[PDB]
């Protein structure tokens, strides 16, 4: 069951309600082609998302035209104005190294809310984490409060030509890797930043996280132009 057959609208709105995002297949056909290599994606990448498929008639013609695609749906409780929840497969063919290459480029969007689970996909490439509180469970609106601060930056950034990953992460539950920036581990609100690149050059944001984003702003700008100090 490397995908979960969903066969009731409240089986997917109940498989789409998680922390993690969905991605569902929507199928007329169940043994089409495309409905192969949907399963042969999933079966390939059964640990790192959660796949799931339909063939309900009021489900598949809500979300597809032509009885066969995919949806990504974002975590609810990390919906923002920066992107949207849904982002639905474009192309025209379907196979599992295209749906691979399609969850990769778009299932985290923008800023992620790193976790023990994803960690290992969202770290590796040219990365600024934001550590703080980040709690949705006793904490939803101190983790967005600070996580539309980060977003509404990088996408500023992201707009113009630049490359860096970006994602929240409990400064808590992450005390271990702040160590490798210098930084420690508070209960405190306010963020600490840093950038760590593919090839392992670790920047530290000095000024203290400014309500207006501006700090971080300055610290970015800072490491894109190429004048800041790496940190060891």
Same mark, same amino acid.
């Given at each position: 069951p490397a995908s979960v057959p969903l066969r009731t609208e409240e089986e997917f709105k109940k498989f789409i309600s998680d922390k993690d995002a969905s991605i569902v297949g929507f199928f007329d $056909?169940?043994?089409s082609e495309a409905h192969s290599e949907f399963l042969k994606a999933a079966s390939n990448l059964r640990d790192n998302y959660r796949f799931a498929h339909t063939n309900v008639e009021s489900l598949v013609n809500e979300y597809d035209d032509n009885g066969e695609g995919i949806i990504l749906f974002r975590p609810s409780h990390l919906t923002?104005?920066?992107?949207?929840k849904t982002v639905a497969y474009t192309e025209q063919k379907m196979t599992s190294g295209k749906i691979k290459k399609f969850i990769q480029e778009?299932?985290?969007?923008?800023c992620p809310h790193m976790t023990e689970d994803n960690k290992d996909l969202i770290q590796g490439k040219d990365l600024l984490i934001a550590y703080y509180?980040? $709690?949705?469970?006793?904490?939803a609106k101190g983790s967005n409060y600070w996580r539309n601060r980060v977003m509404m930056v990088a996408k500023k950034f992201l707009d113009a030509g630049h490359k860096l990953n970006f994602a929240v992460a409990s400064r808590k539950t992450f005390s271990h890797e702040l160590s490798d920036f210098g930084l420690e581990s508070t209960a405190g609100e306010i963020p600490v930043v840093a950038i760590r690149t593919a090839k392992g050059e670790k920047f530290v944001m000095q000024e203290e996280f400014s309500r207006d984003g501006k700090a971080l702003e300055r610290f970015l700008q800072d490491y894109f132009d190429g004048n800041l100090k790496r940190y060891l």
């Open positions: $056909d169940s043994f923002n104005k920066f992107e949207d778009n299932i985290f969007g923008i509180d980040v $709690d949705y469970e006793k904490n």
